[PDB]
Amino acid sequence: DVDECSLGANPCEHAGKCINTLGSFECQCLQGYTGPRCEIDVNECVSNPCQNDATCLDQIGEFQCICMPGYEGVHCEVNTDECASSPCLHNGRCLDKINEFQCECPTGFTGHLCQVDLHHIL
Amino acid sequence: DVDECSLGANPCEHAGKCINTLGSFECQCLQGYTGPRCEIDVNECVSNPCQNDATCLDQIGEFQCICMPGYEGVHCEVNTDECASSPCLHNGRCLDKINEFQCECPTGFTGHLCQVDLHHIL
Numbered sequence: 001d002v003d004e005c006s007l008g009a010n011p012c013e014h015a016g017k018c019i020n021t022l023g024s025f026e027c028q029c030l031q032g033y034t035g036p037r038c039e040i041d042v043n044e045c046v047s048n049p050c051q052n053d054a055t056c057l058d059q060i061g062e063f064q065c066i067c068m069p070g071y072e073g074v075h076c077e078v079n080t081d082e083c084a085s086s087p088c089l090h091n092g093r094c095l096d097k098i099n100e101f102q103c104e105c106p107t108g109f110t111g112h113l114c115q116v117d118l119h120h121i122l
Numbered sequence: 123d124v125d126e127c128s129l130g131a132n133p134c135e136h137a138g139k140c141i142n143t144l145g146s147f148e149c150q151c152l153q154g155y156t157g158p159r160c161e162i163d164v165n166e167c168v169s170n171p172c173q174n175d176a177t178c179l180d181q182i183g184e185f186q187c188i189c190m191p192g193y194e195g196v197h198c199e200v201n202t203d204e205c206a207s208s209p210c211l212h213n214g215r216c217l218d219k220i221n222e223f224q225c226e227c228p229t230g231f232t233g234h235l236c237q238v239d240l241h242h243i244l
C-alpha cells in the first residue's frame with residue numbers, strides 16, 4: 001500500500017482531511033465542500049432559497065439572503081408588518097403594504113398618520 | 123319725507139336692516155354683505171387666503187380652506203410634521219416630507235420604520 005496522505009501534496013482539496021486506506025484513500029471534507037476530493041464548493045443558492053426578489057449569497061457551508069425593502073427573515077419570506085408599531089394616531093385603521101402602510105382615519109381626523117384634528121373646524 | 127323702510131319692499135337686500143332718514147335712507151348690512159343696499163355678497167376668497175393649492179370656499183361672512191394632503195391650518199399654511207409622533211423606531215432619524223416621512227435607521231436596523239433587527243444576522 002501507498003499512503004496517499006503522506007505524499008508531497010494533500011490529495012484532498014479545500015483543506016479536507018486525508019484518510020489513508022489499504023489500496024486507496026478517502027477525504028473528509030470541510031462543511032460546504034463536496035466530491036471525492038472535496039473539489040466542489042456546494043452552491044447553497046442552487047434551489048433558490050431567497051424569496052421575493054432577494055439576493056442569495058453563496059457562501060462556504062451556507063447561504064445568506066439580502067432582502068428587498070419590506071421583506072425580512074432568513075429566506076426573505078416575511079412581509080414586514082409596518083402596522084405592528086401602531087403608527088396611525090386616533091385609532092386609525094392601519095393597512096399594511098410593501099415597505100409602506102396606509103391609515104384610514106376616523107371622522108374628524110386626517111393626514112397620513114391621522115395627526116390633523118378637524119373637530120374644531122366642524 | 124317718504125319712509126323708504128315702510129314701503130312694499132325692504133330696499134335693503136340680503137335681510138339688511140332698513141333705516142329711514144330725512145330725504146333718504148340707509149342699510150345696515152348683515153356680516154358678509156356690502157353695497158348701499160347690501161347687494162354684494164363679499165368674496166372672502168378674492169385675496170387668495172388658502173395656501174399650497176388649497177380650495178377656498180367663499181361663504182357668508184367668511185372663507186374656509188380645504189387643504190391638500192400634508193397641509194393644515196386656517197390658511198393651509200402649515201406643512202404637517204409627520205415626524206411629530208416619532209414613527210421611526212430605534213432612534214431612527216425622521217425626515218419630514220409632504221404627507222409622508224422617511225426614516226434613516228441606525229446600524230443594525232432597516233425597513234420603513236426601522237422595525238427590522240439585523241443584529242443577530244451580523
Ligand SMILES: *[C@@H]1O[C@@H](C)[C@@H](O)[C@@H](O)[C@@H]1O
Pocket residue numbers: 053054055056066067068069
Ligand atoms: C441583491 O440584493 C437584492 C436586495 C436586490 O437588490 C437584487 O437585485 C441584488 O442583486
Ligand SMILES: *[C@@H]1O[C@@H](C)[C@@H](O)[C@@H](O)[C@@H]1O
Pocket residue numbers: 175176177178188189190191
Ligand atoms: C379643492 O380642494 C383642494 C384640496 C384641491 O383638491 C382642489 O383642486 C379643489 O378644487
Ligand SMILES: [Ca+2]
Pocket residue numbers: 001002003004020021022023024025
Ligand atoms: Ca492507500
Ligand SMILES: [Ca+2]
Pocket residue numbers: 032041042043044058059060061062
Ligand atoms: Ca458554497
Ligand SMILES: [Ca+2]
Pocket residue numbers: 070079080081082096097098099100
Ligand atoms: Ca408590509
Ligand SMILES: [Ca+2]
Pocket residue numbers: 100101222223
Ligand atoms: Ca409612510
Ligand SMILES: [Ca+2]
Pocket residue numbers: 123124125126142143144145146147
Ligand atoms: Ca326717507
Ligand SMILES: [Ca+2]
Pocket residue numbers: 154163164165166180181182183184
Ligand atoms: Ca361671501
Ligand SMILES: [Ca+2]
Pocket residue numbers: 192201202203204218219220221222
Ligand atoms: Ca410634512
